[PDB]
Amino acid sequence: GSHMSTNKITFLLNWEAAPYHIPVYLANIKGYFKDENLDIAILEPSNPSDVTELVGSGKVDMGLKAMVGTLAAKARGFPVTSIGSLLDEPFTGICYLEGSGITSDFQSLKGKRIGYVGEFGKIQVDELTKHYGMTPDDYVAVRCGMNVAKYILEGTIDCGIGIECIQQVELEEALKEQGKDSNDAKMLRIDKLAELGCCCFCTILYIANDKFIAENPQAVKKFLKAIKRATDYMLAHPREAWAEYGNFKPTMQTDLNTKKFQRCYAYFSESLYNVHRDWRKVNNYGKRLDILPENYVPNYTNEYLSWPEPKEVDDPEKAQDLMLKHQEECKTCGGYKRLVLA
Amino acid sequence: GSHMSTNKITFLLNWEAAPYHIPVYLANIKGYFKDENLDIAILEPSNPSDVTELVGSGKVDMGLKAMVGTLAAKARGFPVTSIGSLLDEPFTGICYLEGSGITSDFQSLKGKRIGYVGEFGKIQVDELTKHYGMTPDDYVAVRCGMNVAKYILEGTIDCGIGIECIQQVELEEALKEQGKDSNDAKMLRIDKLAELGCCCFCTILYIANDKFIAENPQAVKKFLKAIKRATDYMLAHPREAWAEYGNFKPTMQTDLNTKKFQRCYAYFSESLYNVHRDWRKVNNYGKRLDILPENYVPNYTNEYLSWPEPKEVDDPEKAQDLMLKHQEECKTCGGYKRLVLA
């Protein structure tokens, strides 16, 4: 006896369900996948380090992963390709609490316990040390999975790698509930420490197994159409979309997750396009880190997107500064406002 | 070539991470899988209805599923086999709130919106109607996924199928939040409605893809040894094991989830053995529901377990009465008490 066929396509998130996963869940909830005759089985990982080996080996069809992990996957023999962007350049850094002895000076990290998520965070911090008169032995790296912010708050690490709209928000809100100044939640931006220009290495991407892409090109195209439809809706109607997401996934109804969503809002890619200049820069960064070979070719494609490509940006420094001001403003206001492009 | 193999084995839960998943997470957390040279990738479904098609098609290697869904999967051409038991005969019923017009009489469900999880809940309630002077048109079945208790509380359904140690606990605690009597959270036990004698049909099982079992019998045996090791530890040291689980999965650190764990505790299978009489009874029930063909054989095996099989329980009725009393006491007094075997 054989087995019946399933048309269910597995889609593995990069993390436990989080506010920025809204386009995937909303495309399902609102029937946008069904309208494209797709059945998407959304799966969440217990351990984010499992994602690329599962997608790359073909055990899972599609999913999400940040740019460093995506590039490294194919270099390690797990052939995935980025087919689009979800969250563009979210600020990423070593998060800490003001008054613990850590400052904006990287050298203040001497003798500290620094949390990282899975694997590459430690590689990044280790590489930074030589640029600041330090060695990897000058700190203790602690693998924390999805609990970096929690462990900072609980004091079992002194600081740790996280993104501004997720981990930093958790720190800020926890400080407030304690009666502490939320401004005490700070980060040493990793793009600045590594002298990279922006947090391009932290863009979260839609990825797919190469064989899956080859064997299901229509499905990939239609998946991205449905995602685009949900993304358009969410960007136009964030409050209503957020309510819908939370009705299905009640974890998202909390005040904390709502604060996170407000902070994520400006980062969502409206076009889903892979940004060429970012990929070029992170590829070179990965080579510097000794996780990608010289001559490595970036593993992304825009071939499955069915609408026009936005123009390249000559001045992302300017745009990044606008983002800074926007995010700082978020700390004291409600509401949802997208950045206006130059 | 460059494409590498993975050793990861995918394990898909039957539900969002919940208290009764503790043996799986603990086997991982405490390094019991590692000690058996296993790398288990624990995955959580966003839609429990996806589980058996994924495991049965081979898209996922192993997972959890309750008995009705497990039987139905192989009957429908998605070959999975139960290799052991996780949660034995948990009380399951149509949960409701006192004062809404619903009573212990099934006829009080006329004109009600009744929530079910995925598919078979509706089939079960539909079949029950004929035994209580009703038809499937006498109520409205509403598909709710993992949010049955939530939607009862919010009033968008009137009642719905749930397990005593999960959904009924959510209702009890929410009633306390409203400053109401937690005893207003009740259920019509479905085993009693269906004349089944016990909730055999709701037992939650360890399942695996048939091809995976055939090609990897050694890994299956090792997996079950590691699960048994974690199960032994958790049953012996519930407070400590629970704290370990919550440190990894912070949602489990809540008072609500702790109360759920206390209510789950007596149901865990100590031996992991498939209970023959239950499989016999539920196979016949499935045939009665027209979900299994007349000649269907039950899809389980105990051959991958590595310790003695406990004797068949002499007096199942006596055991079920002890459990009823135990769970009543657990509601009001909490704690961790295992029933003494005859």
XYZ file of C-alpha atoms in Angstrom:
684
model
C 0.000 0.000 0.000
C 1.103 3.528 -0.868
C 0.168 6.850 0.711
C -2.436 9.375 -0.483
C -1.072 12.703 -1.685
C -1.170 15.932 0.337
C -1.272 19.340 -1.319
C -0.416 20.986 1.972
C 2.690 23.136 1.668
C 4.697 23.370 4.891
C 5.714 26.852 5.956
C 8.023 27.086 8.960
C 8.325 30.418 10.782
C 11.726 31.755 11.886
C 10.533 32.094 15.485
C 7.608 31.448 17.777
C 4.518 33.307 16.498
C 5.314 36.996 16.714
C 3.788 40.287 15.631
C 5.685 40.514 12.308
C 4.305 37.137 11.175
C 0.968 38.855 10.557
C 1.049 38.711 6.738
C 1.383 34.902 6.702
C -1.360 34.322 9.265
C -3.626 36.980 7.760
C -3.291 35.487 4.259
C -4.525 32.240 5.760
C -7.231 33.688 8.040
C -8.749 35.913 5.350
C -8.773 33.085 2.808
C -6.189 34.607 0.501
C -4.333 31.293 0.236
C -7.643 29.528 -0.429
C -8.453 32.068 -3.138
C -5.225 30.993 -4.864
C -6.099 27.300 -4.383
C -3.288 26.836 -1.879
C -3.311 24.994 1.427
C -0.519 26.319 3.621
C 0.374 24.451 6.806
C 1.921 27.066 9.079
C 4.417 25.539 11.518
C 6.306 27.181 14.368
C 9.744 26.035 15.480
C 10.633 25.271 19.099
C 14.257 25.987 18.203
C 14.962 28.607 15.543
C 18.300 26.886 14.786
C 16.355 24.022 13.210
C 14.850 26.119 10.416
C 17.411 26.178 7.609
C 18.382 22.492 7.880
C 14.706 21.565 7.655
C 13.899 23.862 4.710
C 17.226 23.215 2.988
C 17.047 19.436 3.248
C 13.516 19.547 1.845
C 11.898 18.215 5.008
C 9.965 21.504 5.058
C 8.982 23.311 1.821
C 9.152 27.018 2.727
C 9.650 29.361 5.671
C 11.258 32.497 7.084
C 14.869 33.247 8.006
C 17.065 36.298 8.426
C 19.684 37.101 5.784
C 22.805 35.772 7.555
C 21.177 32.413 8.253
C 19.792 32.235 4.721
C 23.190 32.873 3.123
C 24.937 30.459 5.455
C 22.414 27.682 4.836
C 23.340 27.170 1.193
C 27.043 27.493 2.010
C 26.618 24.604 4.453
C 24.893 22.437 1.890
C 21.265 23.179 2.710
C 19.984 24.715 -0.541
C 17.439 27.414 0.228
C 16.756 30.562 -1.775
C 15.158 33.802 -0.613
C 12.048 34.466 -2.700
C 11.119 37.718 -0.988
C 11.400 40.054 2.009
C 9.136 40.254 5.072
C 10.825 42.635 7.532
C 13.368 45.072 6.068
C 16.505 45.931 8.094
C 15.107 45.907 11.631
C 17.577 47.567 14.038
C 19.599 44.790 15.692
C 22.086 45.104 18.515
C 23.400 44.003 21.864
C 20.537 44.932 24.183
C 21.287 45.981 27.760
C 19.944 47.798 30.797
C 21.358 51.206 31.682
C 23.207 51.200 34.997
C 24.642 47.680 34.793
C 28.055 48.967 33.760
C 27.484 48.465 30.048
C 27.771 51.608 27.914
C 27.873 52.570 24.247
C 31.587 51.640 24.333
C 32.115 48.044 23.140
C 34.931 47.693 25.703
C 32.359 47.899 28.506
C 31.396 44.349 27.497
C 34.604 42.954 29.019
C 33.693 40.277 31.548
C 30.020 40.252 30.600
C 27.657 37.385 29.860
C 26.302 38.087 26.368
C 23.267 36.163 25.173
C 22.797 35.113 21.562
C 20.022 33.191 19.822
C 21.377 30.214 17.945
C 24.845 30.203 16.416
C 25.734 33.153 14.209
C 25.255 35.781 16.900
C 28.264 34.409 18.762
C 30.287 34.370 15.539
C 29.383 38.035 14.962
C 30.319 39.201 18.463
C 33.536 37.134 18.416
C 34.575 38.810 15.168
C 33.859 42.280 16.561
C 36.249 41.873 19.489
C 39.464 42.265 17.459
C 38.187 45.624 16.213
C 38.034 46.881 19.818
C 41.277 45.582 21.331
C 39.562 42.453 22.637
C 39.397 38.705 22.014
C 36.551 36.200 22.119
C 37.839 35.209 25.587
C 37.050 38.675 26.996
C 33.362 37.820 27.359
C 31.172 34.754 27.871
C 28.726 33.940 25.060
C 25.530 32.291 26.312
C 23.131 30.527 23.930
C 19.587 31.609 24.859
C 17.273 30.666 21.991
C 14.169 32.848 21.961
C 14.606 34.018 25.545
C 17.370 36.643 25.365
C 15.211 39.515 26.660
C 13.680 37.341 29.386
C 17.115 36.327 30.644
C 18.390 39.926 30.625
C 15.422 40.831 32.829
C 15.986 37.833 35.076
C 19.665 38.710 35.375
C 21.077 35.400 34.155
C 22.811 37.253 31.317
C 24.033 40.876 31.349
C 22.980 41.708 27.796
C 22.205 39.972 24.530
C 21.525 40.177 20.830
C 18.007 41.194 19.880
C 15.998 43.367 17.537
C 14.636 46.806 18.363
C 10.973 46.087 17.695
C 10.875 42.819 19.646
C 13.531 42.355 22.356
C 14.063 46.057 23.087
C 10.296 46.534 23.383
C 10.078 43.659 25.889
C 12.798 45.328 27.971
C 11.108 48.734 27.783
C 7.714 47.441 28.829
C 9.129 45.326 31.652
C 11.056 48.310 32.997
C 7.863 50.407 33.040
C 5.939 47.752 34.932
C 8.704 47.774 37.555
C 8.547 51.556 37.868
C 11.878 51.993 36.094
C 12.739 54.404 33.263
C 12.049 52.646 29.955
C 14.885 54.688 28.421
C 17.221 52.416 30.389
C 16.606 49.772 27.716
C 19.390 50.432 25.206
C 21.385 48.624 22.564
C 24.804 48.694 20.976
C 23.752 48.596 17.326
C 25.592 45.746 15.585
C 25.597 47.476 12.183
C 27.444 50.387 13.788
C 29.867 48.136 15.699
C 30.674 46.230 12.493
C 30.755 49.443 10.445
C 28.137 48.208 7.933
C 25.807 51.183 7.378
C 22.503 49.470 8.182
C 20.974 46.347 9.717
C 20.759 44.727 6.265
C 22.067 41.461 7.725
C 18.925 41.271 9.895
C 16.265 41.477 7.161
C 13.809 38.603 7.602
C 13.124 36.805 4.318
C 10.640 34.403 2.785
C 12.706 31.323 1.868
C 12.093 28.102 -0.034
C 13.834 24.835 -0.715
C 15.455 24.911 -4.189
C 13.896 21.648 -5.313
C 10.489 22.807 -4.103
C 10.903 25.961 -6.190
C 11.899 23.954 -9.255
C 8.980 21.546 -8.884
C 6.294 24.029 -7.855
C 6.940 27.353 -9.609
C 3.221 28.218 -9.875
C 2.683 27.604 -6.165
C 5.606 29.833 -5.168
C 4.280 32.615 -7.393
C 0.736 32.283 -6.059
C 1.970 32.060 -2.456
C 3.715 35.415 -2.891
C 0.582 36.887 -4.511
C -1.468 35.915 -1.464
C 1.203 37.268 0.897
C 1.248 40.531 -1.073
C -2.528 40.778 -0.808
C -2.368 40.307 2.986
C 0.552 42.717 3.254
C -1.356 45.401 1.315
C -4.361 44.942 3.585
C -2.347 45.014 6.809
C -0.406 48.153 5.811
C -3.619 49.940 4.867
C -5.607 48.790 7.900
C -3.154 47.920 10.657
C -5.560 48.175 13.608
C -8.209 46.004 11.993
C -5.651 43.530 10.672
C -3.971 43.327 14.083
C -7.336 42.618 15.695
C -7.984 39.801 13.219
C -4.583 38.247 13.892
C -5.104 38.349 17.658
C -8.595 36.823 17.399
C -6.976 33.775 15.829
C -3.724 33.854 17.854
C -4.663 35.166 21.321
C -1.024 35.691 22.396
C -1.103 38.670 20.016
C -3.908 40.379 21.937
C -1.587 41.447 24.780
C -0.556 45.045 25.357
C 3.075 43.967 24.950
C 2.543 42.347 21.565
C 0.494 45.333 20.417
C 3.392 47.639 21.385
C 5.720 45.347 19.423
C 3.461 45.464 16.371
C 3.455 49.278 16.419
C 7.269 49.144 16.451
C 7.403 46.544 13.675
C 5.019 48.463 11.438
C 7.514 50.783 9.735
C 9.873 47.909 8.871
C 7.514 45.710 6.824
C 8.512 45.375 3.189
C 5.622 46.729 1.127
C 6.898 45.214 -2.139
C 8.488 41.988 -0.831
C 11.468 42.598 -3.160
C 14.954 41.411 -2.309
C 17.108 44.536 -2.001
C 20.184 43.927 -4.162
C 22.560 46.332 -2.449
C 21.771 44.845 0.953
C 22.454 41.316 -0.283
C 25.784 42.428 -1.771
C 26.861 43.968 1.561
C 25.816 41.052 3.773
C 27.476 38.583 1.396
C 30.735 40.427 1.887
C 30.117 40.562 5.655
C 29.543 36.800 5.710
C 32.870 36.312 3.970
C 34.552 38.508 6.609
C 32.966 36.308 9.278
C 34.381 33.152 7.623
C 30.900 31.671 7.240
C 30.730 32.151 3.442
C 33.427 31.214 0.917
C 35.193 33.758 -1.253
C 33.295 34.017 -4.546
C 30.009 32.991 -2.902
C 26.938 33.946 -4.927
C 23.977 35.312 -2.891
C 21.008 32.932 -2.796
C 18.013 35.135 -3.594
C 15.636 35.647 -6.487
C 12.944 38.150 -7.363
C 11.695 35.974 -10.226
C 8.512 34.875 -8.436
C 7.151 38.334 -7.619
C 4.289 39.422 -9.914
C 4.333 43.251 -9.640
C 6.899 46.005 -10.407
C 10.222 46.370 -8.604
C 10.689 49.579 -6.602
C 13.670 51.768 -7.506
C 16.995 51.243 -5.732
C 17.775 53.640 -2.877
C 20.931 55.757 -3.186
C 20.640 57.313 0.267
C 19.670 54.685 2.856
C 21.747 56.589 5.442
C 19.102 59.308 5.170
C 16.271 56.759 5.259
C 17.863 55.032 8.255
C 17.978 58.348 10.128
C 14.309 58.887 9.332
C 13.642 55.408 10.721
C 15.524 56.255 13.912
C 13.388 59.334 14.492
C 10.256 57.352 13.673
C 11.057 54.567 16.139
C 12.059 56.995 18.898
C 8.710 58.725 18.359
C 6.889 55.378 18.663
C 8.023 55.160 22.276
C 5.733 58.034 23.251
C 2.821 57.817 20.812
C 0.250 55.312 19.616
C -0.849 54.820 16.050
C 0.648 53.674 12.799
C 2.589 55.755 10.301
C 4.734 54.551 7.418
C 7.923 56.342 6.425
C 7.678 58.454 3.290
C 10.395 57.573 0.772
C 12.700 60.059 -0.916
C 28.384 17.455 -4.463
C 27.462 20.203 -2.006
C 24.009 19.158 -0.754
C 24.361 17.740 2.760
C 22.135 15.380 4.723
C 20.329 16.282 7.939
C 19.991 13.992 10.958
C 17.089 16.004 12.286
C 13.869 14.094 12.901
C 10.744 16.260 12.790
C 8.255 15.931 15.616
C 4.958 17.786 15.214
C 2.778 18.419 18.266
C -0.990 17.888 18.148
C -1.585 21.410 19.436
C 0.073 24.702 20.342
C 2.582 24.109 23.142
C 0.593 22.942 26.158
C 1.257 21.537 29.620
C 0.941 17.886 28.605
C 3.730 18.300 26.043
C 6.203 18.365 28.930
C 7.790 14.931 28.310
C 8.772 15.874 24.745
C 10.237 19.240 25.662
C 11.909 17.895 28.785
C 13.579 15.037 26.911
C 15.085 17.727 24.738
C 15.881 20.278 27.464
C 17.560 17.744 29.756
C 19.627 16.258 26.919
C 17.896 12.879 26.889
C 17.517 12.922 23.085
C 21.176 13.945 22.807
C 22.191 11.038 25.048
C 20.525 8.654 22.576
C 22.278 10.417 19.667
C 18.999 11.934 18.422
C 18.392 15.448 17.118
C 14.662 16.043 17.440
C 13.221 19.162 15.786
C 10.061 19.965 17.725
C 7.453 21.759 15.623
C 4.151 23.300 16.677
C 1.125 23.426 14.358
C -0.911 26.580 13.883
C -3.795 24.338 12.768
C -4.205 20.962 14.462
C -6.082 19.672 11.398
C -2.806 19.714 9.465
C -1.091 17.100 11.623
C -2.067 13.695 10.233
C -1.790 14.634 6.554
C 1.710 15.934 7.258
C 2.835 12.909 9.253
C 1.017 10.396 7.034
C 2.329 11.813 3.761
C 5.843 11.698 5.150
C 6.281 15.475 5.116
C 6.816 15.163 8.879
C 8.387 12.089 10.520
C 6.646 11.852 13.914
C 4.157 13.680 16.122
C 1.190 13.543 18.465
C -2.478 12.955 17.725
C -5.530 11.732 19.614
C -6.960 8.303 18.875
C -9.855 9.208 16.553
C -7.640 11.313 14.301
C -4.947 8.632 14.349
C -7.356 5.864 13.319
C -8.922 8.050 10.634
C -5.590 9.020 9.095
C -4.612 5.522 7.983
C -8.201 4.725 6.967
C -7.983 7.726 4.634
C -4.667 6.688 3.068
C -2.263 8.688 5.232
C -0.367 5.832 6.912
C 0.640 6.610 10.487
C 0.946 4.242 13.425
C 0.675 4.912 17.142
C 3.952 3.895 18.791
C 2.931 4.823 22.333
C 0.589 6.789 24.588
C 1.138 10.253 26.079
C -2.134 11.215 27.755
C -4.520 8.401 28.706
C -8.318 8.842 28.527
C -8.530 12.545 29.422
C -12.091 13.614 30.284
C -13.609 15.338 27.247
C -17.032 16.898 26.881
C -19.191 19.660 25.509
C -18.058 22.484 27.804
C -20.486 25.214 28.832
C -21.221 27.879 31.421
C -24.007 27.476 33.970
C -26.837 29.957 33.433
C -26.782 29.874 29.634
C -29.664 27.408 29.346
C -27.479 24.390 28.707
C -27.885 21.466 31.156
C -26.685 17.861 31.535
C -29.491 16.864 29.148
C -28.260 16.747 25.530
C -31.646 18.102 24.410
C -30.737 21.466 25.963
C -28.320 21.873 23.043
C -31.181 22.489 20.586
C -30.545 25.719 18.678
C -27.093 26.179 20.191
C -23.817 27.126 18.515
C -21.482 24.258 19.408
C -17.763 24.701 18.864
C -15.520 21.907 17.636
C -11.783 21.829 16.882
C -11.152 20.518 13.398
C -13.367 17.958 11.709
C -14.261 14.889 13.729
C -15.840 16.800 16.594
C -18.692 17.798 14.280
C -19.019 14.239 13.017
C -19.237 12.999 16.612
C -21.862 15.496 17.750
C -23.858 14.962 14.537
C -23.993 11.225 15.250
C -25.036 11.775 18.869
C -28.136 13.737 17.873
C -30.060 10.682 16.638
C -29.789 9.133 20.117
C -31.399 12.147 21.801
C -34.404 12.780 19.569
C -32.501 15.262 17.423
C -30.863 15.651 14.009
C -27.685 17.405 12.875
C -29.851 20.356 11.763
C -30.962 20.962 15.357
C -27.746 22.805 16.248
C -25.054 24.824 14.455
C -21.547 23.348 14.502
C -18.846 26.010 14.498
C -15.216 25.233 13.672
C -12.986 26.955 16.238
C -9.549 25.351 16.032
C -7.661 25.827 19.300
C -9.931 28.605 20.564
C -13.079 26.776 21.748
C -12.821 27.927 25.381
C -11.916 31.470 24.335
C -14.976 31.740 22.126
C -17.299 30.345 24.795
C -16.012 33.086 27.092
C -16.460 35.756 24.440
C -19.956 34.515 23.638
C -19.428 33.774 19.933
C -20.327 30.139 20.574
C -22.607 28.757 23.308
C -20.535 25.702 24.227
C -17.967 23.451 22.622
C -15.845 20.331 22.682
C -12.901 20.494 25.065
C -10.729 18.504 27.439
C -11.318 18.846 31.183
C -7.676 19.578 32.023
C -7.266 22.276 29.356
C -10.508 23.908 28.168
C -12.501 23.392 31.371
C -9.619 24.848 33.402
C -9.586 27.937 31.156
C -13.312 28.419 31.795
C -12.905 27.935 35.552
C -10.110 30.475 35.840
C -11.886 33.002 33.638
C -14.979 32.737 35.787
C -12.815 33.518 38.837
C -11.460 36.571 36.995
C -15.067 37.700 36.548
C -15.606 37.225 40.273
C -17.902 34.284 39.603
C -18.211 30.705 40.815
C -15.676 28.511 38.992
C -18.079 25.581 39.419
C -20.212 27.244 36.734
C -17.743 25.725 34.265
C -19.324 22.386 33.310
C -19.399 19.808 30.524
C -21.567 17.108 29.048
C -19.069 14.231 29.054
C -18.901 12.856 25.539
C -17.925 9.315 26.543
C -21.144 9.137 28.559
C -23.201 10.653 25.721
C -21.711 8.114 23.289
C -22.058 5.151 25.691
C -18.303 4.528 25.467
C -17.662 4.135 29.186
C -14.437 6.177 29.105
C -12.690 8.816 27.008
C -10.537 6.269 25.170
C -11.257 8.158 21.962
C -9.407 11.222 23.314
C -6.195 9.499 24.375
C -3.266 11.447 22.919
C -0.703 9.229 21.198
C 2.857 9.321 19.945
C 2.523 8.677 16.200
C 4.974 8.140 13.365
C 4.888 7.870 9.600
C 4.764 4.168 8.579
C 7.629 4.502 6.099
C 9.707 6.311 8.728
C 9.107 3.481 11.208
C 10.041 0.838 8.646
C 13.257 2.603 7.633
C 14.330 3.792 11.089
C 13.285 1.239 13.728
C 16.395 1.932 15.823
C 15.670 5.685 16.025
C 12.047 5.005 16.976
C 13.137 2.756 19.857
C 15.711 5.304 21.019
C 13.121 8.089 20.825
C 10.745 6.170 23.060
C 13.536 5.384 25.555
C 14.279 9.100 25.824
C 10.593 9.953 26.195
C 10.262 7.278 28.898
C 13.260 8.756 30.717
C 11.698 12.237 30.673
C 8.321 10.817 31.666
C 9.849 8.983 34.650
C 11.561 12.191 35.783
C 8.478 14.375 35.370
C 6.192 11.945 37.198
C 8.704 11.670 40.053
C 9.454 15.395 40.298
C 6.524 17.335 38.847
C 7.248 20.721 40.479
C 10.874 20.716 39.390
C 10.164 19.410 35.902
C 7.382 21.967 35.443
C 9.747 24.782 36.417
C 12.311 23.530 33.864
C 9.690 23.459 31.108
C 8.529 26.996 31.945
C 12.078 28.352 31.983
C 12.308 27.232 28.344
C 8.715 28.012 27.336
C 7.690 31.075 29.371
C 3.969 30.708 28.625
C 4.049 27.673 30.917
C 5.075 29.827 33.886
C 1.546 31.222 34.286
C -0.833 30.307 37.086
C -3.341 29.145 34.479
C -0.922 26.759 32.813
C 0.281 25.484 36.196
C -3.310 24.610 37.147
C -3.691 22.880 33.794
C -0.543 20.840 34.439
C -1.910 19.780 37.836
C -5.124 18.629 36.150
C -3.190 16.799 33.401
C -0.882 15.036 35.849
C -3.029 12.014 36.700
C -3.685 11.249 33.015
C -0.087 10.838 31.818
C 0.744 7.306 30.723
C 3.503 5.969 32.946
C 4.379 3.082 30.630
C 3.579 4.642 27.233
C 1.826 1.384 26.257
C -1.086 1.351 23.847
C -4.132 0.062 25.756
C -5.608 -2.776 23.699
C -9.207 -2.576 24.916
C -9.345 1.154 24.200
C -8.169 0.661 20.618
C -10.747 -2.105 20.174
C -13.545 0.125 21.510
C -12.556 3.227 19.527
C -12.157 1.256 16.289
C -15.767 0.114 16.641
C -16.827 3.685 17.490
C -15.111 4.973 14.350
C -16.909 2.364 12.267
C -20.195 3.508 13.856
C -19.293 7.086 12.856
C -18.655 5.895 9.268
C -15.117 7.314 9.395
C -13.510 3.840 9.366
C -14.429 1.004 6.983
C -16.058 -2.149 8.364
C -12.903 -4.253 8.054
C -10.513 -1.624 9.410
C -7.658 -2.761 11.647
C -6.364 -0.534 14.469
C -3.121 1.244 13.613
C -0.920 0.894 16.702
C 2.068 -1.067 17.905
C 3.833 -1.602 21.210
C 6.837 -3.273 19.617
C 9.162 -0.258 19.929
C 8.860 0.028 23.709
C 11.784 -1.287 25.759
C 10.311 -2.249 29.142
C 7.573 -4.616 30.403
C 3.913 -4.186 29.482
C 1.649 -3.513 32.453
C -1.153 -6.050 32.873
C -4.609 -5.193 31.582
C -6.482 -3.291 34.292
C -8.837 -5.719 36.082
C -11.587 -3.207 36.825
C -11.711 -0.215 34.414
C -14.976 1.041 35.959
C -13.322 1.259 39.377
C -10.388 3.143 37.861
C -12.691 5.643 36.145
C -14.470 6.413 39.415
C -11.152 7.002 41.178
C -10.198 9.442 38.419
C -13.501 11.327 38.696
C -12.936 11.829 42.416
C -9.251 12.644 41.881
C -10.018 15.408 39.398
C -12.687 16.898 41.685
C -10.120 17.077 44.463
C -7.506 18.503 42.098
C -9.802 21.444 41.193
C -10.012 22.633 44.787
C -6.779 21.353 46.330
C -4.251 21.179 43.500
C -1.039 19.267 44.068
C 0.408 16.239 42.312
C -1.151 12.858 43.037
C -0.984 9.735 40.872
C -3.737 7.125 41.096
C -2.580 3.854 42.657
C -2.751 1.009 40.125
C -4.655 -2.154 40.993
